Structures are given as structure tokens and as C-alpha cells.
Write a protein that binds this ligand. Structure first.
Ligand SMILES: [Cl-]
Length: 211
């Protein structure tokens, strides 16, 4: 059904869509650790691009308040149910802030989400707030550039890379589409092992603050 594809696109919006097996540690483990260290029962959190609330549900109760936003109204319905403690807002990240957002925040976080939110940090951040981000590639140049543009300092940065395999040709193809690089049977036929096709899952972690 088409109702399934939509759902799948939506729940999967912040992940890679193809089947894959990691040969090493999940490259977002460090991001989870850093996020966990930053949360206290006094912390006011803003999460950009919350999707169906997985992080709101999982880390949200550890904070004083977890405010979160995304664009899709139906997806936000799941987020509200997934995380009853969270305050969830429908926003495309542009123009004026949603009414009731509740700035200022001590933490602004984004897991592979919007990076334009960086340019709103002067309007969103309490003094001594942190901005925490992980991007779906080894280096996401706009993040450091945008943080420089608002006079924020990077206090921690990680460029992470982990061997993975796409177990089948179909999976390799699907990755090719997501990446905008067409998969070719030649490369599969010549380089695929029993594990399938090898590639790197890479992430760029950034923790910043205005010192
Ligand atoms: Cl989930």
C-alpha cells in the first residue's frame, strides 16, 4: 500500500533507508554519550527536526523541558504520543518562532536534522547554552561556517567512520539512489563479498557554545 511507504519514509526520515550491517561500533554512540552528559533536571531543551519523537521519548524525561519541532503534522501526532512530556511544535524552521516555543534554551540539539537553526541561536539560546549536532556524513561544512557566523565556538568535534556492508544488490542500489550516485552492477559483480558491498558509515559530531 501507499499508506505504508509514506509511513516508512516518515519514520525513516532521519536514517539511511537501505539494509546494512555494521562491522564496527555504531558511529552515533558518541553523540548519545555527549547528549546524555549534557542533560540535567534543570535543562531546557530545544530539538530541531524531532520526527516521530524517538529522542524526545528516550532523552526527554531527563530534562526539565524538551521542546521539539518538525514539519509533518501527522508525524507530530506520533511524536506527541511517543513523548507525553515533550512540547511538540509544527514548524518549517523559517520566519518567526512558533508562538509558545519557550526560549531561551540551555541546549539546542539536532540529530541529522536542520542546520539552519544555528542561525537562530541568538534568539533561542540562554547564555552558556550548548548546541549539539550529528550529521550523516564525515564532514558537514555548513555547521562550522554557520556557527562562526553567529560567533559561537566549537568545543568538541568528531569525524567518525565505520565499515558497513549493504547485504544485497537491491540494498546497494537503494543506497546509490539516496546518495545520488547510481549503483552499477559492475562494481557489485566485482567487489561484493559474501558480506555484500562494503562502504563507510560516516558522521560529523559538533558540540558548540558561545564562550
Ligand atoms: Cl523509534
Amino acid at each position: 500500500r501507499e499508506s505504508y511507504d509514506r509511513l516508512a519514509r516518515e519514520l525513516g526520515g532521519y536514517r539511511h533507508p537501505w539494509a546494512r550491517v555494521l562491522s564496527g561500533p555504531d558511529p552515533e554512540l558518541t553523540f548519545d554519550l555527549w547528549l546524555s552528559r549534557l542533560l540535567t533536571p534543570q535543562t531546557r531543551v530545544l530539538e530541531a527536526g524531532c520526527g516521530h519523537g524517538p529522542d524526545a521519548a528516550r532523552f526527554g524525561p531527563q530534562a526539565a523541558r524538551w521542546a521539539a519541532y518538525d514539519f509533518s503534522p501527522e508525524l507530530l501526532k506520533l511524536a506527541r504520543a511517543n513523548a507525553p512530556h515533550a512540547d511538540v511544535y509544527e514548524w518549517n524552521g523559517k520566519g518567526e518562532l512558533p508562538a509558545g516555543l519557550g526560549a531561551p534554551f540551555g541546549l539546542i540539539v539536532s540529530r541529522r536534522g536542520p542546520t539552519s537553526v544555528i542561525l537562530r541561536l541568538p534568539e533561542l539560546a540562554a547564555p552558556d547554552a550548548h548546541f549539539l549536532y550529528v550529521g550523516p556524513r564525515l564532514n558537514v561544512p555548513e555547521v562550522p561556517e554557520r556557527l562562526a557566523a553567529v560567533g559561537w565556538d566549537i568545543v568538541a568535534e568528531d569525524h567518525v567512520s565505520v565499515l558497513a556492508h549493504a547485504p544485497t544488490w537491491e540494498d546497494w542500489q537503494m543506497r546509490g539512489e539516496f546518495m545520488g550516485k547510481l549503483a552499477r552492477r559492475a562494481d557489485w559483480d566485482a567487489e561484493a563479498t559474501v558480506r555484500g558491498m562494503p562502504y563507510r558509515e560516516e558522521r560529523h559530531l559538533v558540540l558548540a557554545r558561545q564562550l
